[PDB]
DNA sequence: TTTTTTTTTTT
């Protein structure tokens, strides 16, 4: 009823942040400075400020958003007149809607209401253009008149042509004029419900969402998103009714978020502890007893090294880990934990994957019969982590497809007239069993591993797990029963905090190698080669890749403590962990 | 509103270039010599000469080009009246527009503006004809009238037939008259964004462009081009509404550049150095330590020999290189560098390619129902370099598809009623691993290589790389760490100018064989054949192909120094490099 | 039916 434009403007200029620093005033000039033409607000803050305004947004969304858009636009023009003639419309987006509904629980009662859905992005289409105001010319020898067809109204989702010329009142031919037509960016995406939300024995459901204007290209497939907007029915093929008054539903996205200053203080506070490295390792798979050297290795792969890009070549910065062990050694359980804690990870099984599905697949589009590309698991994991369980179960002729993606971090396809190259910069963690299921100490190491030396040299670290019963059985049994009894280990960083810590470290820390670290690494690498040549029978080869493994591991150790330099202490830790890897495969040092 | 035709004419007639030769009057001078009806003007030159004139082209391109082009036509007629009755309209193409937009960043605000896009050409269609002014006959026994349908306007993108006869005002049926219709050449192409600008975890995007009149057949697939023109929305089936008022965008090309005299003297200056060959070799893969003999071999393949075309046959002039080595010997890094410095190169892997994708594929169009050919990797690489990494991972029944393309440089297809023969004159560089991952010195060369003798004989040079940990580890380790520390080797030819040097040499240099070079090559071949008879178990056969390899290598060495003939020094170098090849495969002379 | 790359059952 009443106008809240005065309230909205006053709220923007008078709201107080956590430190009462007016967390909203400094967003306005940032909008003006960068001409971002999109401003977001929090529903909790609006409700905390004025209860009446929050309800009107949450209920009368379709008749108040343009009103607040006009009021905000006027406030921008007075603040900076130069904003005019560059941006003709500014959008305000509301987040944190209390109306959250599961994807499977949407009913007809929720149509037309501002709701929020949490799911997984699966498909994204290229950006296109949608007409919201057309212009036609009446092709009738008497008219030759141009007019905007939808009068005082946006063009509906169905493209409708005028039947009677408004300028002359007669029918005839109408020709669209693209020059005078107004367009808006338009993208279509598909969202899927989370695996933990799917009911027993059923496939996950999917919903179609539409992103327009500045919301296009807001996320990539495989992301976890929270989308807010209005639901509506979909009219796709109305040319022929064919009975079937049944319709699907789709969502007009108003605000989207993927997956902060307070968190940064928490992250930096953690790094102040001298024993942060040991504290982080203790937080990796808290439900698994022992395997301290494995948890340390897995922690390094989460942080990785520093990729180097030069004018003529680039160097891999990711760390690859291979684990071989007897059944029941908690290999799969540890790998599942990595998927949860990594900011971006893809979990695959060796038997349930193919060569085309891992890198890229060439498929024939049924509508046109033309071949095109589909991204594989490694491509979708670019910048993240790829987990391959049961690597020994894959066919050897099929496993070689990942050799290029594991060192050059690229995928090359030359099939059916398609030549393409794709980036696959991801870290690979793989697990498997020995050749005879269990490790046989009588036989050498070569026949136990049963893998070609080419793939073995690609892995920075290799650990062989032996399940040897001994005095430690009682400790293991007590630990497992405590887990089943609900007792939880304390003094460990929670998974949510740990994920934020890793994401921050991988984005703002780039350690550099000092002179002291160079001498230690060089001496140790020379020592490997001399020792390796003494026993030319092991299946492990000390190639120059091993030298680069030491550099990557050293940078990861420094990056774990948010250090900008690789001191001698990190080099010693990198050398020490490499020693345990060599002792595992029976290479003494 | 000021008349710019006078400004244009004085700009063309009076302009000073960097060389001080009035660059812009020679182009129009050659315009009438060859009747090319197209003039190229740089945006930097017009802006410097007249800032106001340059701006008017940028923002008023729609209604300034016909006036600007019309003014140029009158000037040409004054220069030579003979241009009349040969060319009706002359097009002016503007390049160097500062408005450069990435392919993924195009939004609605860029529609109708002159922009420039850099990308890769992937698809070209055959040249067709487009109607811009039709002629119709009213089939109604009283009319028998001819009229150009679109009055004072060209035919739009969508063909439209008149509904009311302009000659009588009555409806009816109208018949097109092809002989009185005005046509224009039309071609469609697809541009793909470069792999550098593709975001993480996303597939590359594509844009459709239209070439008309003299711009047709101005490029070939795989080229890197810059296109300037106007964006517009694409209409395909406007008659069928089918809801979904969402359109795709295409581009009307106004000028195209495919990726000068100052380079000629720069290249000539480089060739004057007596040690130019060493400088070129030292500039191949600067980030790789050692492997001097492999760097020399890769340099030869970039330049290549001299193809011979005779009345009854032709002789291959390309050089093929095969490298077999232990894992971690930087084989893939060098191949990556070659794919960047080569003016035209295609990079493929053994596992990610098929027989059809390498040579040619037969694809059926579901619309018409007929079969047609699709160019493979080797066909697209004609006149350039083809890189096939991990060649040993190819299926043997699939690898044999390149036997004829490597020697006869042709692709023969007899499939689905299609018999064809395509040129595949491309050099092949391949790498792979021995049978057991690493070379075993305790076993003969026969079972280490694991490749048929038919394909081995087709390679001019074969190098077996052994990773022997010796006393050079410290030097190798220090070099690698220096690379990781940002240190760069100095006194090398950078990749950009090195690419220009190779392109110039392969185009203007055709060395000849002298009498003294013939004697050295003949004597060496006799000894090579005699020595091979000692060991017949080796899978390396000295065939007459090896004699022609010596000729090709000798020509390549001369081509490096831009020499016009092959002297005894070039023959000696060819013998020396051939000797190292034989020693590696176990033939000692 | 036909060539092609893909997952699938069945020749
Ligand atoms: Mg398991
Ligand atoms: Mg390699
Ligand atoms: Zn009208
Ligand atoms: Zn008529």
Author numbering:
A (entry chain C), B (entry chain B): 7 to 265, 275 to 604
What sentences appear in the manuscript?
A six-subunit ATPase ring forms the central hub of the replication forks in all domains of life. This ring performs a helicase function to separate the two complementary DNA strands to be replicated and drives the replication machinery along the DNA. The helicase/ATPase rings of eukaryotes and archaea consist of six minichromosome maintenance (MCM) proteins. The MCM rings of archaeal organisms, such as Saccharolobus solfataricus, form a homohexameric ring.
To examine the mechanism of DNA translocation by the MCM hexameric helicase, we determined cryo-EM structures of a protein construct of the MCM protein from the archaeal organism Saccharolobus solfataricus (SsoMCM) in complex with the ATP analog ADP-BeF3, magnesium, and oligonucleotide. In attempting to reveal different aspects of DNA manipulation by the MCM helicase, cryo-EM structures were determined with three different oligonucleotides of different lengths and potential for secondary structure. Despite the differences of the oligonucleotides used for complex formation, each sample showed highly similar behavior with two distinct structural classes. The first class of structure is well-structured throughout and binds a very well-ordered segment of 11 nucleotides of ssDNA within the central channel at the ATPase tier. The ATPase tier is not 6-fold symmetric because the subunits form a helical “staircase” that binds encircled ssDNA. The sixth ATPase domain (red) interacts with ssDNA at the at the bottom of the staircase with just one hairpin. This subunit also loosely interacts with DNA at the top of the staircase. Specifically, transformation of class 1 with six subunits engaged to DNA to class 2 with five subunits engaged illustrates a dissociation of one subunit from DNA.
